[PDB]
Symmetry: D2
Subunit: 249 residues, 4 copies
């Protein structure tokens, strides 16, 4: 049971003001990790801190600013020290189908979904190396493997994430840092507004799973804590789909 603890660890979670990142940041805080939540909007982070309890700190930062990311990383280590756990839950889907992709929509998708996870990890790994222990949790997608309408830049980024996660393990796992990717199926969030707003679409997606339902926020708590804890010490370089068996059918 100790096996699954994150008590006394330090975590940084990006995308912590909404969606699955907010859930992850709250789970980790309620499980006793000290949590640094990063997202654009101070007011949304303050509501997060109010719900989350435990011991947290908020940092408003626009993760589309890559030049500033090394300064963010210094901010991240200030409240509680170097993080042991890093969760890259910030992300975007512009939903531009191929013929309508703009340079701007392509670029913001690769920046936020792929490049920012890489560099923020690069900046934060030294502290983990020093302790000989770290957990990196990237966010893969059904669109790591299956192309959906409007998804082309998103799936490019998310096929990138999976290989990036393997490459993170190849570089950093000899030093005690594991890197894996949670692959949520369809959960009600900001990214999935069209999939859920049309109920016929939502129900088709539910029927595509083996269980027969879409995801609820609580469905990610277990797999998150597993990937953030001693339980997963020999699991690295893997994508763990949390999708009710969508990918089995």
């Amino acid at each position: 049971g100790y096996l699954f603890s994150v008590r006394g660890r330090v975590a940084c979670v990006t995308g912590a003001s909404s969606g699955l990142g907010r859930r992850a940041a709250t789970v980790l805080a309620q499980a006793g990790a000290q949590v640094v939540g990063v997202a654009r909007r101070a007011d949304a982070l303050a509501e997060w801190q109010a719900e989350a309890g435990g011991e947290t700190h908020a940092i408003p930062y626009d993760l589309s600013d890559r030049d500033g990311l090394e300064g963010l990383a210094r901010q991240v280590v200030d409240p509680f020290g170097a993080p042991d756990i890093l969760v890259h839950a910030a992300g975007i889907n512009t939903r531009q189908p191929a013929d309508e992709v703009t340079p701007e929509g392509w670029d913001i998708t690769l920046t936020l979904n792929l490049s920012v996870p890489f560099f923020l990890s690069q900046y934060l790994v030294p502290g983990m190396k020093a302790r000989g222990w770290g957990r990196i949790v990237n966010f893969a997608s059904l669109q790591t493997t299956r192309a959906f309408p409007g998804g082309i830049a998103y799936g490019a980024s998310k096929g990138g994430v999976a290989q990036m996660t393997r490459a993170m393990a190849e570089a950093w796992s000899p030093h005690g840092i594991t890197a894996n990717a949670l692959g949520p199926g369809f959960f009600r969030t900001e990214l999935t507004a069209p999939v859920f707003a049309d109920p016929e679409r939502a129900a088709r997606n539910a029927a595509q799973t083996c269980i027969g339902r879409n995801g609820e926020p609580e469905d990610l708590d277990g797999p998150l804590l597993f990937l953030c804890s001693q339980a997963s010490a020999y699991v690295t370089g893997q994508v763990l789909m949390v999708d009710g068996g969508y990918t089995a059918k």
Copy 2:
């Protein structure tokens, strides 16, 4: 914490007299499940029961006898009631290269590794359906995806296990039964004796992982309990590799 509990559950573990099945059976028992361990040898099962503590029951049975499996299933329900968790860890690798495969070595490999998991599952799922809750844990392999010397029947069986696991989810997960496969990399057991007996070979395999070491028995505890608990309710039809990132390189 409670998310990862197996207290009050009943598990059946095949292959419980040695190797990874014995580890799984012990972990489950120490974690508060009632465990029914199935293996060929009574004396080996009795040593298991002695190591394990908790509440367990041993059933000596030669799982190559498929005609008898329905009777085995009735034996398995008798000590503690119908199992909630089933772990198919019994297996064989005859190590016959393709040109030397015999009908008998082929057939015993398919029987033990593929057909027995299916039928014992078939017999034991009714009790899970009645409760609307179940966990099936199959054993996949690096040879689900990568062909090793002497491996052809083994890999046929383990490729089959991966797809069988997705098919178990498609059949059974509407009823609250999840089916997943643990994919150990190289752990010191009965099946892996040549991989370990030559140290140069053992070290090449260790170097193929991201972490740089082969598996130890404790490395499977976390992933097992995750796959046997509430924590993985929305995880079904998946193969979860516990291989130190062997498959990432």
Copy 3:
């Protein structure tokens, strides 16, 4: 034809195709015979085999044999080599789907699916590989499925077998490709055959499956020709241990 077109030649090769009386096996056997291979077709029924030989043209030979008979496979292999000499190309197109859902699977329906779809491909290949090794050249083509990776209703024994096939194909390559023999699996999507009668018989089903592909249609027989000949020729010399999906992009969505 460009000189490189001759990379895809099967002229003067010997092929054995199982399942040659119907479905995709029959198309594969006919394509190879029309492309100038000498083709040994294996199937249960002498009469359906005769219809095949009539359609095919070229140079062919029929062998009626019940591939559920593993005992007799070594004697099949002797029969296969008799008309044209040892085959250079082996195509394992015989297969079954009993469509029994998990709760209704019988020992017999599980068993016949593993026999025909997995064990027979293995043993027949084992018996015919020596001839290929003697020449330093061979092509094995197995049949994978959408159900190599995605579980469909009634599919559980079939999927077990087809996930098996994929790994078995990797293992055939690991054992035999040092000797000049490549082994790959074609993965057809949904094509109109014996095995897919329920998928097609309900038009709404057929259309949902067409819409699941990227192109928007189910398979037609001729769609298998190119991929088959590629996997049976010099063109694929450095392609081994692979599953080649011919599914209109079903598996991309």
Copy 4:
């Protein structure tokens, strides 16, 4: 039994001055396609043209310049009319290990290996759509799936490529355009000089394949022509590994 013809087609091949791109452009020229070859250096493009024979046109262009891509596309259509076949063989591997990745090295790899193929496709697909027929050939890698030393940006890009190819099929294959990726193993080129320069490394990689050898230029011809012809009309969204079975072990 022609099916595999490219006679009469127009092809655009990027990276046509060296390596596998140069092989592809020559193969397609010698098979009777009119070929537009795109690469940085006029003089190396001119040697190519001399070597190739057939009917060709060279366009010197720095593919790191995304701003000018729409203009390149106009140049590409000028000599022979709109291309039917597009082969994205230009690529880079900076070989920076994770801890030493620079923003510039990461950016150039995503640009050349992922963003350029998307945009140049986007600009050239209209011509294909008008005819109801096209073929797009991307370049995947062993690092689509397996992380090698120095590979992290490359691998990010190439996992991106494979999803991008699936998403290209989803967008464009209803209009007669197929999109697939060739996945070469290890062939003697600019990208792979350290793998080949050290003979012990070269031999280890050869031994990792099923056949037991590295690739030769001619090994790409058949798989290329298959992906560029009528033969592959019902093959779309696929990665076709041309690796001697590296990925089977």
